[PDB]
Symmetry: D2
């Protein structure tokens, strides 16, 4: 496949619904060698199962709120993958009270802080921690959302955190380009999931999108997974510092009434 010979780290698998599960599946189908991280003990088993299913026994814990957690994980990784070809960052967080109602009223200093720390800083923290382990030709990928570009109801402070994240992509891309490392993001559309979201009225969002999206359907984790695999392969060597919208053309239309 087009990822044959690549060794890639995938973060944020939490369930088969997780965008990262879709990315891992597709990367694995294209031949990449995979490693996985899990945030906490309550997730370990699951992830360990999925890894197995994808031919991997590299399964490490990592909580991005902790520097030491990140250092330790790469220390362990280095035991098996002294050098590797990049990683997928599919992680985010904000306290739920932040995600419901009038932004101005909902937002708090702490909520703001946490959201940006976990959803944005973590991306460069990881890079900082594995920089010297990366091969020439490596690629880093993160998952964004249209909320970084437009004010969306209830998404609230996540919007600011994702904007911060998209700038992080540009700053990282620029800084690590010359060493041979590419950095991009995928701005995915809302993905249908029966599972309960923390974002107030997500279902409504979904329904709306299906209706006014040019391609007339919401994207799947397979759509995202396939774009992610490509952006992480040498096939996209001419692309860096880019935020690729994988939302079926949703953001480019207006008034599809």
């Amino acid at each position: 496949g087009f990822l044959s010979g690549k060794r890639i780290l995938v973060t944020g698998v939490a369930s088969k619904l997780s965008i990262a599960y879709g990315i891992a599946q597709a990367m694995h189908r294209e031949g990449a060698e995979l490693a996985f991280t899990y945030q906490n003990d309550k997730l370990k088993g699951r992830v360990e199962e999925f890894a197995a299913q994808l031919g991997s026994d590299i399964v490490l814990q990592c909580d991005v709120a902790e520097d030491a957690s990140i250092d330790t994980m790469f220390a362990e990784l280095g035991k098996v993958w002294p050098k590797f070809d990049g990683f997928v960052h599919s992680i985010g967080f904000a306290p739920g009270d932040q995600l419901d109602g009038d932004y101005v009223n909902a937002v708090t200093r702490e909520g703001f802080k946490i959201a940006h720390d976990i959803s944005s800083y973590s991306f460069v923290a990881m890079a900082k921690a594995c920089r010297s382990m990366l091969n020439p030709g490596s690629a880093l990928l993160t998952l964004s959302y249209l909320g970084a570009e437009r004010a969306i109801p209830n998404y609230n402070v996540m919007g600011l955190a994702k904007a911060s994240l998209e700038a992080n992509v540009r700053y990282m891309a620029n800084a690590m380009g010359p060493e041979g490392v590419r950095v991009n993001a995928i701005s995915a559309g809302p993905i249908r999931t029966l599972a309960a979201s923390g974002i107030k009225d997500f279902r409504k969002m979904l329904a709306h999108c299906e209706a006014v999206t040019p391609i007339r359907r919401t994207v799947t984790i397979e759509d995202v997974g396939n774009s992610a695999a490509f952006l992480c392969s040498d096939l996209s060597a001419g692309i860096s510092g880019e935020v690729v919208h994988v939302d079926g053309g949703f953001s480019i239309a207006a008034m599809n009434e």
Copy 2:
């Protein structure tokens, strides 16, 4: 003038070179009544002097790092201006080490945190605190920079913080619009000063802009002040949630060689 009868709070005057000084000056010329804040004791006397020069005796302290400090200030302001028409937010900060050299190597969790806290969160923290005191037809304004949209050397983490700030402008605009409050930003070009910059190689950056800027000069605090006054008046009633570039066209050109 076109600000006649308006009452506006101006923050971040620190010197005659401060962007807010140019803003207060122009606003005062157009007939606004102003109030001033100052960060700490070292700055109090300077602010008091400028304020008198501009006909104001409302000079209050406010450190945006503290919620208590913001509340206290608005509580005191409410003594003389029980309702007002908006404020200018011309504040930012990042620890020195953050603005020199390779972004990824320079960035730290703490640095990121302070940068986003004082530079982006503070804008909404102020709005939350005085929401009830604003008149319909009120306008809020903050100062941004191109680093939010493009990766610029040495600006590093401040780049991410401004991005978050411009998203704040949109989320704030959308939330407060229906109450009749407008929220905008001005992405100002680098301004020439004799003072010294904490941003590594700022002088070089000036020299370059001057050369390739379509209007062939850097903009002044009068340029910025004039735009801010307009953005804060009833003359811009149809503009909200916008980031207006006041940089003489610099950002719209490429390779002016």
Copy 3:
């Protein structure tokens, strides 16, 4: 006022509903001296009446489809205003059939051609013709619409023509900057009228904007006029090559439901 002593040519007045009327009105209030053009004989008397109302007796004909017509007009204008300070370009056109239904089915080579010719080329054609007559500190302004950035139903080919127009603004800005001419555009929101629109379902489009527009109302020609006056004054000396959105924040929100 802030336009005092300025001499500005205003094009595209056709009625009291015309955007240019709102522009001339506001500019006249701020102290500018104006001149007016009119497309053909059917419009001459209306323009003459408005012009007198606004203290001007310079009313000249100009059909932008013709180079000769542009030259002739500036030759006549030069009789009274040998040098002036810029013009407002508020002209556009596309044949009826182009603005109804499926874009791909509606578009034609001719339609495309006329649309781009009168709607985009005319802006630079005017600048080329009067370049030598402009004072340093002059400003040119054109009127755009969101259709340039997003695909909006029925706007169809005009969408492509406005995109070309906004690029014209940047190329013009960059070319004329060093001579001291500024060039900008205002991307105005849909304005409510009793008149009738050639854009299929314009009324629906209004209704929708009203609902989801952050300031909860459509903008007026006074809103636009006020912004244009500012953009054409020395107060915006640091703004060039910009497309300022005067649509009450509409474009920066999504799913205001």
Copy 4:
């Protein structure tokens, strides 16, 4: 390969240096079945040679300045490919006098017209002509350039034409989405070519780009070809109406001094 089973039409092969040659090579490596067009007789032989080398004997003449030319070509194509899966539009043109010096001085009504007709209209003209022949799951691709977003010296009116083109992508995407056809563009960086360009000082552009581009090299026709193959495959089913920058991160940085 990932294009196995697809039948794709490639326009604008003129030499082995042509971006379309790079796209055809990569699509052919991924298994697509190809057809080729040539503009005029002086190009026929060459193209016929290249097609042969890529396992194709479908080689038709087509001059996009002519509607009948386009109709006739699809008539002929339909003889062998009654239905197919899309096409690559790698065509553009402007008279050379347009591409040198001050934009305002260089631009003419005719030059403007031609540039937009051949470089932009042709893209929707082709779609219009083969709409009913397209399979569900089809994709259309065009080649843009950063000049559509920023004022670039000497690129002049091509800039306006490319902006028009990028809007065409959005309008087309929106209009044909619901039938199952995707439409995107690739905004490629300047590509090194020893062959003589019509754009004044192109070499300089090249040199500059190599130096300040994050990845520190210019992209190749292989880089572009690979992105094009992906964007034309079902692998990018979640992407439509997008302008993907394939320029090594060049457009996202500033002041790489």
